[PDB]
Amino acid sequence: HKSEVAHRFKDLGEENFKALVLIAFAQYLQQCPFEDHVKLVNEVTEFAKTCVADESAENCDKSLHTLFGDKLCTVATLRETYGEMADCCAKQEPERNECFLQHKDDNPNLPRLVRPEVDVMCTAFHDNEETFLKKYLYEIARRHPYFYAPELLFFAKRYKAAFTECCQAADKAACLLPKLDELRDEGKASSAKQRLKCASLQKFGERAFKAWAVARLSQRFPKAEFAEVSKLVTDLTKVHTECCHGDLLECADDRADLAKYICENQDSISSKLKECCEKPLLEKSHCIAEVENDEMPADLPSLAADFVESKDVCKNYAEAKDVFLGMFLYEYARRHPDYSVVLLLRLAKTYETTLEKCCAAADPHECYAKVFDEFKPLVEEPQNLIKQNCELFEQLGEYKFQNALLVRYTKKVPQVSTPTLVEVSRNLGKVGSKCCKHPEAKRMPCAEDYLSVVLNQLCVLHEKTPVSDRVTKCCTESLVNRRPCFSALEVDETYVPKEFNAETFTFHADICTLSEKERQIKKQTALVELVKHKPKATKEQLKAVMDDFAAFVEKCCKADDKETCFAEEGKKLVAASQAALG
Numbered sequence: 001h002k003s004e005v006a007h008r009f010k011d012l013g014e015e016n017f018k019a020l021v022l023i024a025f026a027q028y029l030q031q032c033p034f035e036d037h038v039k040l041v042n043e044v045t046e047f048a049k050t051c052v053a054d055e056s057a058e059n060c061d062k063s064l065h066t067l068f069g070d071k072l073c074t075v076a077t078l079r080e081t082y083g084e085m086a087d088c089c090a091k092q093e094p095e096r097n098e099c100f101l102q103h104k105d106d107n108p109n110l111p112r113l114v115r116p117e118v119d120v121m122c123t124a125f126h127d128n129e130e131t132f133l134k135k136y137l138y139e140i141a142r143r144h145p146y147f148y149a150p151e152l153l154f155f156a157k158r159y160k161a162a163f164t165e166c167c168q169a170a171d172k173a174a175c176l177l178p179k180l181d182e183l184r185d186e187g188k189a190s191s192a193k194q195r196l197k198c199a200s201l202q203k204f205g206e207r208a209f210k211a212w213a214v215a216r217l218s219q220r221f222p223k224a225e226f227a228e229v230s231k232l233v234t235d236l237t238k239v240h241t242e243c244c245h246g247d248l249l250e251c252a253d254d255r256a257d258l259a260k261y262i263c264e265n266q267d268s269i270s271s272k273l274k275e276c277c278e279k280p281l282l283e284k285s286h287c288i289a290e291v292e293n294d295e296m297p298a299d300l301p302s303l304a305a306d307f308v309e310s311k312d313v314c315k316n317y318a319e320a321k322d323v324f325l326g327m328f329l330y331e332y333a334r335r336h337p338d339y340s341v342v343l344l345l346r347l348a349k350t351y352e353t354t355l356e357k358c359c360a361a362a363d364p365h366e367c368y369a370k371v372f373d374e375f376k377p378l379v380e381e382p383q384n385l386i387k388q389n390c391e392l393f394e395q396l397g398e399y400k401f402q403n404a405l406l407v408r409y410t411k412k413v414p415q416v417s418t419p420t421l422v423e424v425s426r427n428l429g430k431v432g433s434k435c436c437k438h439p440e441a442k443r444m445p446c447a448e449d450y451l452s453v454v455l456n457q458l459c460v461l462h463e464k465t466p467v468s469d470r471v472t473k474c475c476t477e478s479l480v481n482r483r484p485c486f487s488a489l490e491v492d493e494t495y496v497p498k499e500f501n502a503e504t505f506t507f508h509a510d511i512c513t514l515s516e517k518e519r520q521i522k523k524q525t526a527l528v529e530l531v532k533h534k535p536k537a538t539k540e541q542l543k544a545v546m547d548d549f550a551a552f553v554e555k556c557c558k559a560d561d562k563e564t565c566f567a568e569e570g571k572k573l574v575a576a577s578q579a580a581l582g
């Protein structure tokens with residue numbers, strides 16, 4: 001308790017400590033070279049070991065914040081490289097630390113990381129495992145300055161396991177590349193979710209966040225009392241606040257305390273927490289955040305008795321509105337792990353809205369009596385969309401399902417740029433691949449999780465380059481109306497067709513030699529453009545052009561000669577398709 005560095009050092013172990021100190025420094029000093037960070041890591045590690053051997057040695061009594069800032073301020077090139085950030089070094093703690101957070105530039109001006117050739121990676125890995133993994137850890141951390149460090153470490157170890165397994169493999173590429181791709185997709189998803197949660201907290205306020213957190217925690221911990229859930233919600237809320245502010249040190253301490261508590265009160269919270277509650281300090285909270293829903297208690301009363309049939313409803317509600325409403329959410333959510341959180345939120349809002357009306361009426365009990373019937377069309381709405389879309393997905397498979405979305409959404413919002421429609425339709429396609437493989441009871445939470453990020457990202461793009469008032473509308477609506485607003489978008493009949501352009505519908509033989517992935521992109525790009533030029537073409541008319549085109553490509557990649565086939569039959573395709581559409 002005398003030395004904080006010594007304590008984290010012993011809790012973490014040297015390997016973990018060295019890796020975490022690297023990430024921490026990378027995130028603040030995003031411009032310094034790797035070799036300079038390695039020096040810092042080594043100096044701090046050496047210092048930490050002095051304090052382990054003698055708790056009373058010099059500076060071992062200093063706080064982590066103070067030690068960290070001291071080291072940041074020793075970098076002599078600070079004013080030259082980071083300018084204003086160097087002025088933080090003139091301040092005392094905690095203002096100094098606060099000053100550093102202010103200059104932690106997210107989305108910095110750095111070139112995208114390029115994946116080298118498989119044999120190249122594997123050879124660098126075998127020849128120098130440490131620098132290979134540490135160098136890349138440094139490259140990822142500096143580009144993702146807000147990514148919670150220990151989760152970034154959890155990714156790194158999965159990257160190591162991917163190289164260990166696959167480099168020793170017969171077909172390295174067939175092993176490694178789909179593993180690297182899955183990890184890229186999960187990594188980008190985790191990051192986007194983290195940014196999404198901090199954005200929500202900021203745009204919408206604490207109340208909406210707590211309501212979200214009550215529903216989520218209640219689904220996950222159905223055996224827990226409302227007062228345990230209420231406690232966890234308060235703590236969670238403080239944790240996210242601190243973690244969103246960007247202070248790695250405070251964030252990590254707040255998380256550790258929370259995980260420790262949950263594990264000490266295990267039996268009072270969930271039966272499924274045993275695995276997580278034995279794991280080491282570094283992994284506890286990440287494990288807990290991931291845990292499966294517990295099984296719901298079997299003998300649960302009808303909701304109607306406490307929330308519709310009770311005579312004291314308004315009396316219990318006016319006494320403490322947010323508490324009553326929160327109890328409603330807890331009760332509704334633990335009974336429905338199959339609903340999305342935002343759906344549980346729409347329900348709570350509806351109940352609130354009717355209680356605000358009914359409790360002021362002559363006879364309350366006979367006003368709010370049929371409230372549960374207004375729930376029905378709110379529940380069925382996302383259920384039907386998921387059914388319809390997963391049926392369509394299973395008949396067509398990922399790629400053609402993607403093409404169907406492309407047509408649907410290009411017609412709805414044709415002013416959106418072609419490359420953007422292709423991207424979102426492809427991403428939406430993936431959500432179909434992931435979520436439709438689940439049985440009905442798990443589909444809606446799955447969709448919510450993927451859709452919320454796809455929708456956020458989208459809204460962020462549109463913010464940069466505005467195109468439609470309809471998109472702006474849905475993007476700035478309550479968090480709980482967002483997706484319903486997008487779902488309600490009509491075909492744009494206001495839209496004037498894009499002038500025909502021959503270059504857009506000319507194809508060369510280079511499309512026979514491109515990767516399946518890039519072959520798809522090319523064809524999907526043309527499709528969007530086709531819909532933009534002929535927005536009133538029927539599903540049937542469009543299917544005829546797509547069938548011809550497919551054949552047109554088949555006839556000119558598998559024969560003898562090719563360049564003339566594409567130029568010859570292509571002119572015939574464009575002309576025949578043009579007359580078929582008027």
Ligand SMILES: CCCCCCCCCCCCCCCC(=O)O
Nearest residue numbers: 020021067068252255256281282285
């Ligand atoms: C000069 C001091 C440098 C020390 C660098 C900070 C590294 C310590 C932070 C690691 C604690 C993380 C504990 C995990 C908590 C959790 O998420 O459950």
Ligand SMILES: CCCCCCCCCCCCCCCC(=O)O
Nearest residue numbers: 208210211322325326348349478480
């Ligand atoms: C233990 C108290 C937790 C606080 C819970 C407050 C209950 C509010 C439920 C109404 C739903 C509000 C939906 C949030 C976003 C929105 O307003 O659109």
Ligand SMILES: CCCCCCCCCCCCCCCC(=O)O
Nearest residue numbers: 216220239240243258285286288289
């Ligand atoms: C950044 C703070 C994750 C915090 C870790 C504390 C673990 C207890 C909370 C477990 C419930 C899940 C909360 C995450 C919400 C979600 O699943 O989307």
Ligand SMILES: CCCCCCCCCCCCCCCC(=O)O
Nearest residue numbers: 409413416420458461462471486487
């Ligand atoms: C630059 C921003 C582009 C604007 C967005 C254009 C693409 C619209 C995508 C709509 C996805 C909505 C998901 C709801 C599922 C549904 O009911 O269709």
